Amino acid sequence: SEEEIREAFRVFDKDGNGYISAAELRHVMTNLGEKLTDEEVDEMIREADIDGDGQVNYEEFVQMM
């Protein structure tokens, strides 16, 4: 759906600043029960990080999904 991707981003962007950071991504994964390192989180971000800022914006997130 389109409204589902909008809702998902809103939930992962902990501070609501418009960007999902590595810390935020690591945080949700850890709460779900994943054991991960910052290196693992970085690889995930590299798969979505188009403009190369190290974080995931809304546009990048939707592409990712």
Part in contact with Ca ion (CB under 5 A); list of ranges 1-9, 30-38, 52-60: 52-60
Residue 56's DSSP bridge partners are 20
- Separation of CA 20 from chain center: 5
Q: Are 49 and 60 in contact (CB under 8 A)?
A: yes
Contact mark string toward Ca ion, 6..45, x via CB under 5 A? -------x-x-x-x--------------------------
The most distant pair of C-alpha atoms in the chain lies apart, rounded to whole Å, by: 31
Annotated binding-site ranges for Ca(2+): 13, 15, 17, 19, 24, 49, 51, 53, 55, 60
